Amino acid sequence: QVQLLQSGAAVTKPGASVRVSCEASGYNIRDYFIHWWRQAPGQGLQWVGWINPKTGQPNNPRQFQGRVSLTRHASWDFDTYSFYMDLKALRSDDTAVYFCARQRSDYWDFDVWGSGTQVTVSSASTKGPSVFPLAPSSKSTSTAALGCLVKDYFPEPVTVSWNSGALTSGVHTFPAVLQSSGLYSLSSVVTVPSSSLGTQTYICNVNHKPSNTKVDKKVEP
Amino acid sequence: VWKEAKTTLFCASDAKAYEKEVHNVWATHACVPTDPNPQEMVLANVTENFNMWKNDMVEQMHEDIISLWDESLKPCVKLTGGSAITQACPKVSFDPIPLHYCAPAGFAILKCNNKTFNGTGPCRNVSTVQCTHGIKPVVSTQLLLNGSLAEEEIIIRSENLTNNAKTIIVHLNESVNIVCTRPNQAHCNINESKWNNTLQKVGEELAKHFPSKTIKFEPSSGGDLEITTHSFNCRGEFFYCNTSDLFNGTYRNGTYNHTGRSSNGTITLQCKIKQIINMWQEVGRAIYAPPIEGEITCNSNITGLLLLRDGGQNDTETFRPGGGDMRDNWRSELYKYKVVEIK
Amino acid sequence: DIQMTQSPSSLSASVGDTVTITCQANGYLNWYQQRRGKAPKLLIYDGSKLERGVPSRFSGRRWGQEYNLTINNLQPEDIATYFCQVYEFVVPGTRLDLKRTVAAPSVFIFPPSDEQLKSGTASVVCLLNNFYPREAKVQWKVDNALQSGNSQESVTEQDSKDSTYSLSSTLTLSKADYEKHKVYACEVTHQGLSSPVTKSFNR
Numbered sequence: 001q002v003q004l005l006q007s008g009a010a011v012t013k014p015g016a017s018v019r020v021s022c023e024a025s026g027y028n029i030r031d032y033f034i035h036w037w038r039q040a041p042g043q044g045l046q047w048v049g050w051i052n053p054k055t056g057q058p059n060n061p062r063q064f065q066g067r068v069s070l071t072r073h074a075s076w077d078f079d080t081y082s083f084y085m086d087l088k089a090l091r092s093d094d095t096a097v098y099f100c101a102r103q104r105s106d107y108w109d110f111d112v113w114g115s116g117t118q119v120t121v122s123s124a125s126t127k128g129p130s131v132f133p134l135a136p137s138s139k140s141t142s143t144a145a146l147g148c149l150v151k152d153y154f155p156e157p158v159t160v161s162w163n164s165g166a167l168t169s170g171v172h173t174f175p176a177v178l179q180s181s182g183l184y185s186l187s188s189v190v191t192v193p194s195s196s197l198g199t200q201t202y203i204c205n206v207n208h209k210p211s212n213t214k215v216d217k218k219v220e221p
Numbered sequence: 222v223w224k225e226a227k228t229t230l231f232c233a234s235d236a237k238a239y240e241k242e243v244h245n246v247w248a249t250h251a252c253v254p255t256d257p258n259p260q261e262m263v264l265a266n267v268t269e270n271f272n273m274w275k276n277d278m279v280e281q282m283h284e285d286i287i288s289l290w291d292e293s294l295k296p297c298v299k300l301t302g303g304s305a306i307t308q309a310c311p312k313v314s315f316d317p318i319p320l321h322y323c324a325p326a327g328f329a330i331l332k333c334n335n336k337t338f339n340g341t342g343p344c345r346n347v348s349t350v351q352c353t354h355g356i357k358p359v360v361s362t363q364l365l366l367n368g369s370l371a372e373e374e375i376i377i378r379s380e381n382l383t384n385n386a387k388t389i390i391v392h393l394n395e396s397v398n399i400v401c402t403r404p405n406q407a408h409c410n411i412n413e414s415k416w417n418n419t420l421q422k423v424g425e426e427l428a429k430h431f432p433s434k435t436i437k438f439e440p441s442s443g444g445d446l447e448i449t450t451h452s453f454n455c456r457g458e459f460f461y462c463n464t465s466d467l468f469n470g471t472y473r474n475g476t477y478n479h480t481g482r483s484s485n486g487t488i489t490l491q492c493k494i495k496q497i498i499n500m501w502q503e504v505g506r507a508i509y510a511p512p513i514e515g516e517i518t519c520n521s522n523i524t525g526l527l528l529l530r531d532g533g534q535n536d537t538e539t540f541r542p543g544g545g546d547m548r549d550n551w552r553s554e555l556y557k558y559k560v561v562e563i564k
Numbered sequence: 565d566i567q568m569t570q571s572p573s574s575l576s577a578s579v580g581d582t583v584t585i586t587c588q589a590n591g592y593l594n595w596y597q598q599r600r601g602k603a604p605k606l607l608i609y610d611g612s613k614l615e616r617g618v619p620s621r622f623s624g625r626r627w628g629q630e631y632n633l634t635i636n637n638l639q640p641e642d643i644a645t646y647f648c649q650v651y652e653f654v655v656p657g658t659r660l661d662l663k664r665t666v667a668a669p670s671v672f673i674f675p676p677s678d679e680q681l682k683s684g685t686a687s688v689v690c691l692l693n694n695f696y697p698r699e700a701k702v703q704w705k706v707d708n709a710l711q712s713g714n715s716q717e718s719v720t721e722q723d724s725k726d727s728t729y730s731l732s733s734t735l736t737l738s739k740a741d742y743e744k745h746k747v748y749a750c751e752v753t754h755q756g757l758s759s760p761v762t763k764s765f766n767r
């Protein structure tokens with residue numbers, strides 16, 4: 001039974017360094033190279049490089065040579081291998097999920113991958129969200145949609161409920177995107193009947209458990 | 222009249238049972254004296270296929286040399302993760318002796334004659350020798366301290382050039398001298414004039430299979446001191462010469478420009494004899510006694526390189542020194558041989 | 565120098581359908597499956613050889629530089645992105661979508677709140693609610709001028725109810741820059757539209 005166990009999610013400020021481990025076990029470890037990959041939201045897998053277990057010899061692309069260093073650590077009876085990836089000077093676009101994988105053969109087939117570790121490069125400490133209303137100023141039929149705006153918070157996640165959990169029909173909560181400021185921001189909209197405005201109270205409930213922030217907001221044009 | 226097979230080959234030698242050095246000592250109670258007149262049944266019009274990277278002869282040579290270093294140059298304390306050992310660590314004469322390897326009756330070793338043969342694929346000119354030519358087993362990373370040279374043009378050896386995980390072996394044409402001394406903190410000495418000419422022509426061959434790109438040479442990308450730093454063994458002393466200024470140049474437009482900090486028209490690599498050594502043979506660390514008192518000098522002639530191409534996307538391929546696995550050294554000598562059963 | 569291209573980008577099929585994707589390559593190719601927010605799973609290596617433990621309905625045929633991946637009798641557990649890989653190089657891949665009727669997005673636009681203007685920042689949110697397929701193009705226009713490098717958009721997942729998507733783009737700029745213009749537009753393009761649709765507002 002071969003399993004590659006990676007470290008837990010790490011949040012690091014830009015300029016500083018980060019270490020991503022990968023506990024390899026359950027096979028003839030020395031005979032197979034361990035490669036690293038990183039995954040930015042969407043896009044495609046990006047090759048970080050491989051490392052020779054027995055030798056320690058790394059191989060990185062020029063875009064990483066200097067900032068990254070691949071090392072390893074053996075165990076007692078070598079039943080446990082710790083593969084470390086160190087990234088020195090972190091920047092904005094270094095924010096991704098890194099994948100520790102195993103090169104099985106010369107075909108470059110990777111059969112065993114790690115669960116991955118979320119590396120988020122940001123220096124926002126811990127802040128609550130700023131809830132802003134979404135309403136149609138001019139009534140041009142729009143069958144009608146409105147919502148709230150979760151802005152500038154850290155870190156994930158934020159639970160959004162409408163009318164204290166009553167309204168679920170047509171409710172769309174969007175996945176948060178990390179801004180360039182190092183703060184998360186999502187929005188949640190719901191489709192409401194055109195004649196429901198005025199004769200119905202619409203209240204959104206934004207919850208940010210990390211910073212212990214819960215805000216109720218009422219939206220109407 | 223013949224086919225490929227596997228056999229427990231035996232080694233031939235020109236050693237002597239009266240010498241102090243551990244090589245002659247071993248090569249007498251482990252090898253059989255040379256012929257020294259082997260028959261060269263050379264014939265043309267017959268094509269055979271070879272493969273230096275999946276060759277059975279290499280593993281056998283790897284085995285005997287393993288037993289050599291283990292029982293000869295004996296350390297003081299070894300560590301095997303949970304079980305250490307303590308023993309006597311005597312200093313001794315350590316200078317390699319050229320060895321041969323031969324096939325028993327019913328078997329035969331096929332020899333290619335195409336001096337431009339890379340290491341894989343077919344070969345037009347074949348021959349048959351019962352044994353192999355004189356080969357000096359020298360354990361060394363990055364550089365090949367002692368070996369043969371093709372009188373023809375420079376040949377590049379790799380299991381796959383497209384595969385950056387495959388170590389590249391460069392078979393030169395001209396000899397380059399290297400001197401490492403310890404006066405009475407060590408250092409090597411390499412002639413920049415020759416070194417520039419060599420890397421000039423190496424690039425011409427590297428730019429053959431990778432035409433559009435500008436070839437570079439950067440120091441090792443990291444790892445153990447044995448692999449990053451050009452490590453070897455002279456008279457039983459484990460030398461580690463910093464190569465950061467050895468591989469530091471760029472080849473473009475049929476011309477090579479070297480940085481390298483040549484302070485006197487000669488490349489100087491700061492060496493250092495270590496006593497804590499990551500063993501290449503078995504997995505573990507072996508400790509040794511401090512060097513001998515006096516001069517420690519051996520004049521070597523590098524005949525090959527061990528490089529690894531960096532993968533990724535820039536119309537410019539950078540090459541860093543590699544090695545580690547000592548099988549590769551003996552593949553650059555046994556590339557022209559193969560075991561074949563007569564039956 | 566390894567050249568690899570994969571077709572198509574977008575892909576839609578129903579359950580039990582026979583699907584095929586192609587990837588031109590000049591090296592050892594391997595097919596992978598990656599579910600959302602998880603590690604990739606190996607399916608086919610050497611262009612043909614099937615990975616152990618992988619459903620036999622998956623298969624690949626290799627000839628020349630043309631590589632096919634074929635999934636006979638599609639299953640709900642097969643809805644994920646599929647990317648082909650040669651050595652160090654990985655193609656973005658083919659996103660497999662649960663097939664539905666082509667639908668136009670319901671476009672909405674929301675003017676920046678007053679409270680946000682207090683902060684000195686202004687955000688306009690264009691909404692694309694319930695549509696298919698996933699492919700959409702949202703361009704921001706301020707005073708008939710295309711905005712580039714100051715807008716981020718997030719897309720929800722395919723619903724198990726209506727099998728559609730939702731897109732929310734957000735134009736981000738300063739209050740100083742917000743108070744130098746008048747008309748804020750929102751151009752949207754989709755396969756389910758006769759022509760690009762614009763939803764704008766004034767101050």
Ligand SMILES: *[C@@H]1O[C@H](CO)[C@@H](O)[C@H](O)[C@H]1NC(C)=O
Nearest residue numbers: 263264265333334335346347
């Ligand atoms: C075969 O190779 C040998 C060198 O090993 C050479 O002497 C001989 O001329 C070659 N045969 C032919 C026909 O070229």
Ligand SMILES: *[C@@H]1O[C@H](CO)[C@@H](O)[C@H](O)[C@H]1NC(C)=O
Nearest residue numbers: 339340341342343377378379
């Ligand atoms: C050796 O030559 C064959 C063709 O005869 C070629 O396919 C192969 O790539 C070469 N090997 C090296 C090490 O370049």
Ligand SMILES: *[C@@H]1O[C@H](CO)[C@@H](O)[C@H](O)[C@H]1NC(C)=O
Nearest residue numbers: 373374375393394395396422
């Ligand atoms: C080195 O190889 C080059 C390749 O063309 C050749 O021109 C030159 O004569 C060789 N020099 C030696 C080592 O004699």
Ligand SMILES: *[C@@H]1O[C@H](CO)[C@@H](O)[C@H](O)[C@H]1NC(C)=O
Nearest residue numbers: 417418419421422476477478
């Ligand atoms: C390096 O070596 C080449 C080949 O010997 C020679 O032609 C060239 O002048 C040398 N380059 C420099 C700039 O010294």
Ligand SMILES: *[C@@H]1O[C@H](CO)[C@@H](O)[C@H](O)[C@H]1NC(C)=O
Nearest residue numbers: 359366367454455519520521
């Ligand atoms: C390489 O060969 C030379 C010439 O015989 C010899 O002097 C030298 O000691 C050898 N180098 C080593 C350390 O193996």
Ligand SMILES: *[C@@H]1O[C@H](CO)[C@@H](O)[C@H](O)[C@H]1NC(C)=O
Nearest residue numbers: 446449450463464465466491
């Ligand atoms: C080799 O020497 C260079 C120059 O001082 C140094 O930067 C490098 O760290 C050294 N290499 C090792 C691994 O000792």
Ligand SMILES: *[C@@H]1O[C@H](CO)[C@@H](O)[C@H](O)[C@H]1NC(C)=O
Nearest residue numbers: 432433434472473474475476
């Ligand atoms: C080589 O470089 C020179 C400039 O140093 C340039 O004029 C020439 O066109 C180049 N030749 C080729 C074939 O690259």
Ligand SMILES: *[C@@H]1O[C@H](CO)[C@@H](O)[C@H](O)[C@H]1NC(C)=O
Nearest residue numbers: 439440465466469480481482
């Ligand atoms: C290349 O050599 C120069 C001169 O010694 C040195 O300053 C530079 O750091 C080297 N580059 C490396 C270490 O790759």
Ligand SMILES: *[C@@H]1O[C@H](CO)[C@@H](O)[C@H](O)[C@H]1NC(C)=O
Nearest residue numbers: 395396397398520521522523
């Ligand atoms: C180095 O190799 C050359 C090959 O011709 C040889 O002439 C020279 O004697 C060697 N140097 C020594 C002393 O090892």
Ligand SMILES: *[C@@H]1O[C@H](CO)[C@@H](O)[C@H](O)[C@H]1NC(C)=O
Nearest residue numbers: 341380381382383590591592
């Ligand atoms: C090297 O790998 C490539 C991968 O496509 C393959 O096409 C080629 O045949 C291989 N070379 C050999 C025969 O070792």
Ligand SMILES: *[C@@H]1O[C@H](CO)[C@@H](O)[C@H](O)[C@H]1NC(C)=O
Nearest residue numbers: 584586625626627630631632
């Ligand atoms: C790949 O599949 C396509 C259809 O999707 C087919 O036209 C082509 O023949 C296949 N390629 C090969 C050579 O198997």
